[PDB]
């Protein structure tokens, strides 16, 4: 009778189970900030020519 290496099929594991899909990592590179500021304009209360 014919003799040969028996064929064994691996089993177990898990394929396409409980898809998560969360690989994103937040963060990027762009400009830092802007150094801008302003004062409260200029007030003027003067009349009568007090020298």
């Amino acid at each position: 009778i014919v003799l040969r290496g028996p064929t064994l099929a691996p089993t177990l594991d898990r394929t396409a189970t409980h898809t998560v899909t969360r690989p994103r990592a937040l963060g990027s590179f762009h400009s830092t900030a802007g150094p801008a500021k302003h004062a409260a304009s200029i007030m003027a209360e003067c009349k009568d020519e007090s020298r």
């Binding site: 801008a36 500021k37 302003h38 004062a39 409260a40 304009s41 200029i42 007030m43």
Partner: protein, 51 residues
């Protein structure tokens, strides 16, 4: 932005009477933006705290 075949054929003249595009036509692209800002009122005056 991408133009249209109607635009590229109306750019040249040759239109018949009462066609609008009888003479060559010129076009200009315009873009407007709407944003936010903060105004501070104090000491009987106004100014931009962030500018």
């Amino acid at each position: 932005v991408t133009m249209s075949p109607e635009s590229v054929v109306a750019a040249a003249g040759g239109g018949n009477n009462n066609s609008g595009y009888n003479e060559p036509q010129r076009f200009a692209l315009v873009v407007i933006a709407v944003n936010h800002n903060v105004i501070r009122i104090m000491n009987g005056s106004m100014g931009f705290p962030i500018l």
